[PDB]
A paper describes a structure:
Haloalkane dehalogenases (HLDs; EC 3.8.1.5) form a family of enzymes that catalyze hydrolytic cleavage of carbon-halogen bond in a wide range of halogenated aliphatic hydrocarbons and their derivatives via SN2 nucleophilic substitution followed by the addition of water, and releasing a halide ion, one proton, and the corresponding alcohol as reaction products. The structure of HLDs is composed of a conserved main (or core) domain, consisting of eight-stranded β-sheet and six α-helices, and a versatile cap domain formed mostly by α-helices. In the present paper, we describe the biochemical and structural characterization of a new HLD from psychrophilic bacterium Marinobacter sp. ELB17, paradoxically possessing the highest thermostability among all biochemically characterized wild type enzymes from HLD-II subfamily. Crystallographic analysis revealed three unique features of DmxA that can contribute to its unusual thermostability: (i) a unique composition of catalytic pentad, possibly lacking one out of the two halide-stabilizing residues; (ii) enzyme dimerization due to a disulfide bridge; and (iii) unusually narrow tunnels connecting the buried enzyme active site with the surrounding solvent.
The crystal structure of DmxA wt was determined by molecular replacement and refined using diffraction data to 1.45 Å. DmxA wt was crystallized in a primitive orthorhombic crystal form, encompassing two protein molecules in the asymmetric unit. The two molecules in the asymmetric unit represent the dimeric form of the enzyme, which was also observed in solution. DmxA wt contains four out of the five canonical catalytic residues in the active site: the nucleophile D105, the catalytic acid E129 and the catalytic base H273, forming catalytic triad, and one halide-stabilizing residue W106. The second halide-stabilizing residue, which is asparagine in HLD-II subfamily, is Q40 in DmxA wt. During the refinement of DmxA wt crystal structure, the electron density present in the vicinity of the active site was interpreted as a water molecule and an acetate ion with an occupancy of 1.0 for both molecules present in the asymmetric unit. The water molecule (HOH511) is situated in a canonical halide-binding pocket of the enzyme and interacts with the nitrogen atom of one halide-stabilizing residue W106 Nε1 at a distance of 2.94 Å. The side chain of Q40 faces away from the halide-binding site and makes polar interactions with the side chain hydroxyl of Y68 and the main chain carbonyl of L203. This suggests that Q40 residue cannot be involved in the stabilization of the substrate nor releasing halide anion in DmxA wt active site. Interactions in the dimeric interface are mediated by 3 salt bridges, 10 hydrogen bonds and, interestingly, an intermolecular disulfide bond formed by cysteine 294 residues from each monomer.
Numbering used by the authors:
A (entry chain A), B (entry chain B): 3 to 296
The structure:
């Protein structure tokens, strides 16, 4: 992957399970770990990070296979992603961690926090994987037919991702309210220029929990939600209108369901809200970490 | 003035300088003082207060001459409003105050807070008077025409306020996105049904600081903004899109200019944002008071 000229944070790499994972880093102190999802990378947070400079050690990591991380010769099943992100976090020896997470990055962050609660200081999340999606008819029409068709066969998934590159070229722009500049979209294309490598883009849409399927992802997500409902850890839910994974009424559900949950509304956004309201998102996290000067 | 049907807080009156000032009240603890501006009254906050019950002693006051307050035979210059609101606050012996303020209520609130900082616990404000308006070119052309014409002569100000009642009849509904129900508009009309009494409505738009005019208001506002820039008191700026006195780019400036400032975006609104997003406004204040240990 060629590093985009508009990503002004330094590239570092950690050795994890015989591969290298990329992350950008800024500052010192307790870590603020930023976790992206499908089909993005740490670039997604480039305009959010400036709002949090000086609030701790910013670490925005690319999941294995994504961004500027290596693409080892592996299936990129959910277990793979779990192992490699755990390996990353261990490789850096992170503790006292504030996770800032989105989409699959929230599945992984929440599952990590569930398994290592002692290592967490706080959880900030947006357009996250919280209560499982109960079925296709309760799922947002924006993507419902897209997911059904992709999930119906490996051939369909491969056509859609490898030949048509639909997640990058179509879904991503469609789930951002403002128009992307060409070099911004090019940044999202840049890890995925090779057709065969785009097989990797199949696995997240094949594994999104819908109607308890896949069953392993349903069990893990159900289990971290049960745990989230008991944890006293400070939580921040950043939300947009109309949103996607977290529409407006679901926001209020979480205020009641999750202890010590604060919220911040950032206005118009669908799924990749960092592209619509980065400054507001960053400032929401900053204000929440500052705790009114207490 | 008769109490509106949808204003469900009990009416009280304080004796201040030989007149009665109306206020509504709820609860106990450290006070939340709600301050309205032009051409409203405490009714403006009727749907905000329910979000804050149990968070302190809620006190929403009508400026002298406004709402259900008496209309004594006085000039109603800015100094008169200062003396009567000081007299109100003293009459109730309010201390450890969280001021929640809007438009001219913010001018009076901030001027009080600047002179008596030891009486203040926090400041929550929206569509407020912070940096003076730099010139008439800060308004869109319709609004600029309104102010210019009103300010050009006493006869124009009297026509517009006394004969046309334009602040109630036009500006008010124009600066709320949703349509007002008939009883809501009637509530705003009700203190101003008398033509002679509407002379009072001239003073605020004649004294709004625009391009350093008038000089008294420029001095006082410049002084309290300097003070706001230094105090660590908790502050909350609630804002809407596109807003009016505080448009989006100003919000961002205040984020950096004023210490310990939290922001809360409430979505669509112009000036009288209480009428568009009262629940969100109230909830934003509630969350910020909890964060701030208020
Ligand atoms: Na490897
Ligand atoms: Na949705
Ligand atoms: Na915010
Ligand atoms: Na009097
Ligand atoms: Na006093
Ligand atoms: Na206007
Ligand atoms: Na701020
Ligand atoms: Na600040």
């Amino acid at each position: 992957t060629q590093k985009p000229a508009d990503f002004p944070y330094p590239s570092h790499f950690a050795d994890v399970l015989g591969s290298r994972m990329h992350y950008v880093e800024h500052g010192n102190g307790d870590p603020l770990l930023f976790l992206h999802g499908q089909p993005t990378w740490s670039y997604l947070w480039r305009k959010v990070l400036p709002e949090l400079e000086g609030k701790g050690r910013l670490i925005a990591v690319d999941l294995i296979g994504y961004g500027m991380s290596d693409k080892p010769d592996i299936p990129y099943d959910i277990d793979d992603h779990i192992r490699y992100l755990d390996g990353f976090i261990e490789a850096l020896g992170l503790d006292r961690i504030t996770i800032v997470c989105h989409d699959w990055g929230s599945f992984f962050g929440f599952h990590y926090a569930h398994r290592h609660p002692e290592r967490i200081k706080g959880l900030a999340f947006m357009e996250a994987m919280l209560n499982p999606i109960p079925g296709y008819d309760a799922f947002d029409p924006q993507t419902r037919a897209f997911f059904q068709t992709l999930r119906s066969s490996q051939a369909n998934a491969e056509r859609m991702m490898m030949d048509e590159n639909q997640f990058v070229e179509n879904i991503l722009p469609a789930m951002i309210c403002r128009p992307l500049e060409r070099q911004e979209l090019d940044a999202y294309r840049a890890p995925w220029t090779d057709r065969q490598s785009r097989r990797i883009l199949c696995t997240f849409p094949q594994n999104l929990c819908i109607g308890k399927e896949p069953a392993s992802v349903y069990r893990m997500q159900t289990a971290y939600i049960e745990w989230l409902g008991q944890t006293d850890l400070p939580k921040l839910l950043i939300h947009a209108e109309p949103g996607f994974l977290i529409p407006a009424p679901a926001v209020d559900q979480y205020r009641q369901q999750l202890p010590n949950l604060e919220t911040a509304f950032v206005g118009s956004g669908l799924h990749y809200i960092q592209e619509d309201q980065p400054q507001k998102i960053g400032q929401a996290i900053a204000q929440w970490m500052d705790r009114c000067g207490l």
